[PDB]
Structure 1
Amino acid sequence: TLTYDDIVGTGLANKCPTLDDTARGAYPIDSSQTYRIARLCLQPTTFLVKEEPKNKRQEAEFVPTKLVTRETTSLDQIQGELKVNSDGSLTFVEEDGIDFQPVTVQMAGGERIPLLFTVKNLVASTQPNVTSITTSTDFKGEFNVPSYRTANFLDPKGRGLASGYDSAIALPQAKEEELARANVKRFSLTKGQISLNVAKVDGRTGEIAGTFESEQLSDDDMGAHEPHEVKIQGVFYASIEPA
């Protein structure tokens, strides 16, 4: 098969595995066995940002953006328990993995939108009575979105939350209040929402693949400005295992 030296520099390392067109099977679930997802992979194909209109009577649309951070976007090696619930629904509870990527996209006109693309602490569920995972199975869930920068991050004048100056030291006698938003760093933690639509299943292997769409807030630069709403779409792949 393909080794690192086959793949290095091709772009494939950012691509989730695909399933053949024959993968249309059913993966049976025994409510007596415990399972895990041994590998969840999410490859974004589109980032959309919701425009923010001047009057809030206009309907705000999600608009296309251009990716400027290259092929560094995919979430992978995610794993966690796949619980079988009382009512036969399945629940994925993320425990670990490469489960975030900082991403920057650009609006028409050049506005750059950094976001922490993520499914940290994902708890996603199916509809009830899932005796088998099929191309009709879906997962819907919620996850956490912590600040895009972590607490040590210092702005360009040295100011920070867990480190840094607490004032604008270049303006030794300016008034503080107008600068409070810039000087007092804050750490956001918000919720995002995701849906995974299975489209392929290899029952013989436990592998599934399909499409996903999530929604989360973008970088608020440690409280300095209002984040935007992002909509991420792409393909996914998962390997389920008895465990």
Structure 2
Amino acid sequence: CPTLDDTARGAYPIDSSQTYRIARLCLQPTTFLVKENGEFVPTKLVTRETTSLDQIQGELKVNSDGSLTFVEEDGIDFQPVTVQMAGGERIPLLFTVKNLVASTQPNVTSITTSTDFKGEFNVNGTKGQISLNVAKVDGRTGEIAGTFESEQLSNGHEVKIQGVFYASIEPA
């Protein structure tokens, strides 16, 4: 995924007379954890191709309480991944945010480093929750970056995925 300019600073104002969209959301996983003996334990990523979800996009609605809701409407939102447990078992996983709907706190008059998106996704047998923690905003360009954590069920396993994200916001 892309990154922000070294001089990126500020907040991205939200004009409540305008409508907005996420033009691109890119999720790059850094960590896959699988539950074993009741504990989430780390695994080794063995897939050598790209594991990122990218081109995710959709309307960013301004709600009556001032919160924003992102509705995923298109994107590459599904990547097959294989991870390896310490003892050697290989587990095929599905990394996805298909049908994501995620919302911020109320009264979000700008996007700032304390804005969060929290939501749920679900595709066939995979259902999950994700939190996007914004860490840096370029108020000039509408680019944001941060970290994410997702929890899901994939092929009979409880899985936690962490990583970094980039997104681009623009008017409609």
TM-score (normalizing by structure 2): 0.93
Q: Is contact 1:89-1:125 (8 Å) kept? A: yes
For residues 188-226 of structure 1, give each alpha carbon's deviation from its aligned partner in whole angstroms, at most 9, with x where no partner exists.
Answer: xx42000000001001001000000101112xxxxxxxx
Q: Is 59-68 or 76-85 further displaced after alignment?
A: 59-68
For residues 92-139 of structure 1, give each alpha carbon's deviation from its aligned partner in whole angstroms, at most 9, with x where no partner exists.
Answer: 000011111011101111111111100000000000000000001000
How many angstroms apart in 2 are the aligned matches of 1:38 and 1:44?
A: 20
Q: 1:117 to 1:242 in 2, by over 3 A?
A: same
Q: Is contact 1:24-1:135 (8 Å) kept? A: no
Structure 1 residue 31, shift from structure 2 partner:
1.2
Q: Residue 72 of structure 2: SS of its match in structure 1? A: strand
For residues 133-158 of structure 1, give each alpha carbon's deviation from its aligned partner in whole angstroms, at most 9, with x where no partner exists.
Answer: 0001000000013xxxxxxxxxxxxx
Partner of 2:15: 30
Q: 1:33 to 1:67 in 2, by over 3 A?
A: same
Structure 1 residue 58, shift from structure 2 partner:
10
Partner of 2:133: 197
Runs of 4+ in structure 1 off by over 4 angstroms are none
Q: Is contact 1:115-1:217 (8 Å) kept? A: no
How many angstroms apart in 1 are the aligned matches of 2:36 and 2:26?
A: 37
Q: 1:193 to 1:89 in 2, by over 3 A?
A: same
Structure 1 residue 21, shift from structure 2 partner:
4.3
How many angstroms apart in 1 are the aligned matches of 2:2 and 2:36?
A: 41
Give the helix-richer structure, 1 or 2: 1
Q: Is 129-138 or 58-67 further displaced after alignment?
A: 58-67
For residues 30-71 of structure 1, give each alpha carbon's deviation from its aligned partner in whole angstroms, at most 9, with x where no partner exists.
Answer: 11111110000000011111xxxxxxx997211110111113
Q: Is contact 1:48-1:62 (8 Å) kept? A: yes
Q: Answer 1 or 2: higher relative contact order, Cα 8 Å, separation at least 6.
A: 2
How many angstroms apart in 1 are the aligned matches of 2:78 and 2:64?
A: 31
Structure 1 residue 78, shift from structure 2 partner:
0.7
5 Å matches for 1:3-22? 16-22=1-7
Q: How many residues align?
A: 168
Identity of aligned residues (%): 98
Please, what is the CA RMSD of the aligned residues? 1.7
5 Å matches for 1:81-96? 81-96=59-74
Q: 1:77 to 1:133 in 2, by over 3 A?
A: same
Please list every run of 5 or more consecutive structure 2 residues that lacks an aligned counterpart in the other structure.
none
Q: Is contact 1:44-1:73 (8 Å) kept? A: yes
Give the strand-richer structure, 1 or 2: 2
Q: Which has the larger radius of gyration?
A: 1
Structure 1 residue 24, shift from structure 2 partner:
3.2
Q: Is contact 1:36-1:82 (8 Å) kept? A: yes
TM-score (normalizing by structure 1): 0.67
Q: Is contact 1:194-1:214 (8 Å) kept? A: yes
How many angstroms apart in 2 are the aligned matches of 1:66 and 1:90?
A: 36
Structure 1 residue 72, shift from structure 2 partner:
2.2
Q: Is 79-88 or 106-115 further displaced after alignment?
A: 106-115
Q: Residue 73 of structure 2: SS of its match in structure 1? A: strand
